[PDB]
Design a protein around this ligand. Sequence first.
Ligand code: ZN
Lengths: 559, 282, 38, 102
Amino acid sequence: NQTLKMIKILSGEMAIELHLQFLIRNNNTDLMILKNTKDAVRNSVCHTATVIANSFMHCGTTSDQFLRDNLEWLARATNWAKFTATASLGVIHKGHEKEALQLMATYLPKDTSPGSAYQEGGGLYALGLIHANHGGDIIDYLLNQLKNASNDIVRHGGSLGLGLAAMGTARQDVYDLLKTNLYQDDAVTGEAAGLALGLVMLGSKNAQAIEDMVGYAQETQHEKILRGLAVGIALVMYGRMEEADALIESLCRDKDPILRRSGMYTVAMAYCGSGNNKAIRRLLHVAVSDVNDDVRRAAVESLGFILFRTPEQCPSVVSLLSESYNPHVRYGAAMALGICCAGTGNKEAINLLEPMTNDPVNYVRQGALIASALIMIQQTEITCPKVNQFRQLYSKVINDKHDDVMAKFGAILAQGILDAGGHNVTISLQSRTGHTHMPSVVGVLVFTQFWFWFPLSHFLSLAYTPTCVIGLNKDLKMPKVQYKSNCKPSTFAYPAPLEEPNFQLLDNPARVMPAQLKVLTMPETCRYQPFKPLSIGGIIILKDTSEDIEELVEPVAAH
Amino acid sequence: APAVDTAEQVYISSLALLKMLKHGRAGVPMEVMGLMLGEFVDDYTVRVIDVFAMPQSGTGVSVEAVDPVFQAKMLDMLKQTGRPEMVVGWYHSHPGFGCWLSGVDINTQQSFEALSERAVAVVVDPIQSVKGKVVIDAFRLINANMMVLGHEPRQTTSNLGHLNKPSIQALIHGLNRHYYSITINYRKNELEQKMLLNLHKKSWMEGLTLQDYSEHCKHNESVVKEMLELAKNYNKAVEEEDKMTPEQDPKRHLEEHVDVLMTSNIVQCLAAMLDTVVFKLI
Amino acid sequence: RQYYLSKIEELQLIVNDKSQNLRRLQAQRNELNAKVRL
Amino acid sequence: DLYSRYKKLQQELEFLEVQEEYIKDEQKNLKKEFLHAQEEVKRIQSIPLVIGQFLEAVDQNTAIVGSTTGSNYYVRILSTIDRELLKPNASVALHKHSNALV
Ligand SMILES: [Zn+2]
């Protein structure tokens, strides 16, 4: 009896369910910012960017009200843009496993001048997105679809869904099917095949998969396959630390620049958070010495993954790369600071990124905006002074009708990241208790590949870790418990929607900033008592001290 | 309706670039043209394996300037040689006009794209490709129907196509209105790089060949005289510095003169001494 | 005990020296990178 | 306390060493790139160049030159040129394809 409950808890269904309920209840996304943004979108690039940002802010909240209102504007998407929109639909519905097949069937395919294969592939990839890291029940359906999939675009979307749902499971059947799809030797599906091999055998250190993938990367001719296999090789060796030195050397000495980029990504993933001085030395030597711009950018951004566990040491090393003559090195330094100090709101990082928001090179500006949004997620004006200024900067860049299209794309995604999940999520590569959150690391790394493939940007939704404090009873249901934040209400409140006591009371679930968790206590008058000290926060069990009848938090409906 | 991606790249082979440059210079001041051989690896890659020139014709660079018989015999006979690559596209040199397509160029490109949808019309400037910069661009087309209905000519899925900025000259001559510039990437493997490195690899000899001692003394005397004059200028400037709160420096010119004297003299001494040791009677 | 303090002060002086040197090298690289960029 | 401070000191010294080696390597590569850029700037002064008359200076780095081909252009001055010798109607050589006051 009780063991079944423990298995239910460990399987994650209850945890994702309560996270989803917290997101729906505390859904405070502002639609006016998106209204202005869609007012200021002219080209298809900014259109896709707006779609992605809408997905980002409604990530997991299952609130597609913006898309429902602006279906006419959404219909302008076509080809891979339509694919990306259909995928973002899944990011909106993150965690909605129960009615996943039914809801995807509500967007049933059709027939028109586009073969709707983009729609099918986007639906498959969105289905994989809903079941990120938890595809245990969708795996067989997606396997059957992929084996039965005939179109190329459908194959790409399905491979992405398979890899992302079976992330890290290291199952052999899915690996074999995706290896078959990769060996079908096609560019459009090859990116998805390589990424899916990276996801499925994530952190496995398997000699067979690595050998097959490296050999194919040295054998094929399609560059998209090369990028997919590069990120796949990176993800297969995740967190393996010094065990990956042989592969790291073998990819560093490769003649192909894509393989050198793969080696840099592998250096990032194997030593994520270690701060290993040898890995930092290799990364810096490559970033200042390599002849290919992309490899320099990858090497210098990998410092973020290496140093995220010590963010205060990180601007000290990336500041000089921020001023490098090479525009790719500058963009990589921006992304390294954004990855490195993600969700920390570091003051030095922003003091670095502020002058870099006006770099003459457009993609450097886009990267600076993305990184600033990553760092300032959920931050408030008192916590970090420049947040409002950066919001104004994003709005100006969107409303500047002469700024470059890439810069506008970056600003759209920055707006989406800043208010992600209705200001209810942050980016935390570290776990609550100090672990490396593998889904967050993988999602951020693959999101950095948006430079090469726009639909890869939805992978960032994995890094969206809710900033919530869930109190549970012995039944595991949710009692109506109120928590006390011993701080000024405006210190960690929601940002003022677009148009005084020293404490505040917070209900269950409690949306609490990671800095707010420190000063958040619980009143003595409350009949419950925290089990683990409330400073660590997160899913917290409250021990009841009275037999007075419990009033449970009424479960909100979906959407 | 499928649209060519903005990430599509034209992988120009190294020798393809060399042949294009040589043929473009040869034709100056006239315009030359030739056919580009390779394979359409995928929808995002065009690999120009090779190029062969075409006879200069009185028409200029047009679709009547491609001799069907010459094109044929060259194609079958190169296939016999071991280059069985489909004709990817064509090229012609705009000498000093920059890279763009004139009305006849778009006409010929339409003729070429009648053969295959993926077919580029790269051009090269043989005189603006002075040492350093190489002025070559690759345009395919913009079908009139796609533009007039308002849809963007190419779908975008990455920043690859936006890394480089289009030029005003090409823009006025119809870029982004009748044709789009495809990013050009140079497939250069290590073997070809090492072989090209022999162009300026001096020898194993001049690493041991001493510079003429009399010329060495004259160079040294000239440099030390220049060091004299620069040092006098430095002394005068520094004497001014004291009667100067923060408000060509003889110092820098002095410094690079010092650096040149350093390298020349130290190299001469060391080289002479190694020549004493290794080039020994024993 | 006092051994801890002696090691700490020695590492502290070494760190001050190396930080001052690193600031100097960063300034040199700054001016050289500015020249290259110009 | 004491031991943690000692460990932080040793870690900070190690990180300082990493930054030191990185900065040395980047200094070497930047010197190489600076030499290459200087070579490019010197090469832009090659021949042939069209003669022109330096009409008037506008900025610290741009000027108006009347090219001997019979047309006046607003062009860019090369940085290395001594400004003091740039006097009105001084004959200047301009880049053939950009007319920059070389
Ligand atoms: Zn022409």
